[PDB]
Amino acid sequence: PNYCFAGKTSSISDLKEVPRKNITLIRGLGHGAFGEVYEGQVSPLQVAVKTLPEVCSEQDELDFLMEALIISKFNHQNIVRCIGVSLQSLPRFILMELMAGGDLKSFLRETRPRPSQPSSLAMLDLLHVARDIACGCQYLEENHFIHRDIAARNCLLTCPGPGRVAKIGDFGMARDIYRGGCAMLPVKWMPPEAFMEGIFTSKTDTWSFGVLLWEIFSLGYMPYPSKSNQEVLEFVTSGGRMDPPKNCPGPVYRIMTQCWQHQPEDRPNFAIILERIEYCTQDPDVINTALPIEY
Numbered sequence: 001p002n003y004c005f006a007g008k009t010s011s012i013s014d015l016k017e018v019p020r021k022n023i024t025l026i027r028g029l030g031h032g033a034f035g036e037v038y039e040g041q042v043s044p045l046q047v048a049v050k051t052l053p054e055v056c057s058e059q060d061e062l063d064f065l066m067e068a069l070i071i072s073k074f075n076h077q078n079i080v081r082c083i084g085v086s087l088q089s090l091p092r093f094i095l096m097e098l099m100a101g102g103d104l105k106s107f108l109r110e111t112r113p114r115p116s117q118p119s120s121l122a123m124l125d126l127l128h129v130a131r132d133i134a135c136g137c138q139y140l141e142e143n144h145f146i147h148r149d150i151a152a153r154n155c156l157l158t159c160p161g162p163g164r165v166a167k168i169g170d171f172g173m174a175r176d177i178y179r180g181g182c183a184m185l186p187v188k189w190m191p192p193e194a195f196m197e198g199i200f201t202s203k204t205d206t207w208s209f210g211v212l213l214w215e216i217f218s219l220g221y222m223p224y225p226s227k228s229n230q231e232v233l234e235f236v237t238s239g240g241r242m243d244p245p246k247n248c249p250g251p252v253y254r255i256m257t258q259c260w261q262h263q264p265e266d267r268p269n270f271a272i273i274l275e276r277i278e279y280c281t282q283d284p285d286v287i288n289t290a291l292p293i294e295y
């Protein structure tokens with residue numbers, strides 16, 4: 001089974017097989033419903049290890065291989081690196097760049113300004129995260145790769161503290177399409193034409209990035225508070241959009257509303273999104289805006 005990205009075709013042969021003896025698991029990182037994730041080290045190189053359960057179907061096996069090929073073929077600083085794989089021993093491993101800041105949704109929720117830590121985050125921190133992910137998205141766009149699932153839960157941070165870099169860290173939806181059910185669709189992140197006609201383009205990711213921006217500036221809230229998937233589907237198709245997050249500067253909210261234009265042609269590409277984020281970061285009135293302190 002081959003994988004095609006950009007101009008090139010790659011195969012399982014192209015993956016970097018790391019000798020299993022060189023790999024040591026250290027601790028769990030919060031395992032999902034299928035496959036575990038560990039902190040590990042390679043002989044030392046610090047890594048995250050994604051595992052394939054040994055009790056799995058052949059389709060699961062092909063899914064795991066395809067994920068390894070997809071991530072291994074990306075080359076961008078805002079996309080998590082694949083250090084290698086261990087596919088010749090069981091359970092099979094994919095080895096990733098260790099993003100010690102964890103996923104972005106959890107980071108935002110856990111790092112909200114509080115009376116004890118009133119200065120944990122500032123507007124600039126959020127703008128830098130937004131810029132980081134938009135840079136990753138621009139790389140995907142210019143290489144004609146549609147992510148399909150841009151959302152805070154699928155982004156990672158290099159570290160919790162000040163020098164953090166945000167990166168896109170999961171490509172499971174894209175993998176599935178390359179190779180499911182309504183209840184599992186990221187409805188709240190999808191544009192009208194996506195869930196209606198099943199049409200996908202890079203402007204699909206623009207819409208989702210708008211929702212990510214809302215997640216970021218809301219400090220990790222679930223989009224469309226109190227609305228179910230179907231309610232959001234009908235709301236969005238009717239022209240409904242989310243209100244600004246609490247204390248969100250107008251220039252930032254306007255990037256969101258542009259990302260959520262009904263017509264894909266009316267939505268900005270990621271080059272433009274990056275330009276607008278950069279302008280926001282220059283504006284003193286934006287970056288001097290205080291985030292809410294949760295009590």
Ligand SMILES: C[C@H]1Oc2cc(cnc2N)-c2c(nn(C)c2C#N)CN(C)C(=O)c2ccc(F)cc21
Pocket residue numbers: 029030031032037039048050080096097098099100101102103153154155156168169170
């Ligand atoms: C496949 C997995 O990858 C990594 C996870 C972590 C770090 N680095 C990588 N590469 C991580 C997480 N939490 N913490 C505390 C750490 C640490 N250190 C998040 N997590 C448990 C995930 O499963 C997850 C979530 C989203 C996503 F995009 C990829 C992943």
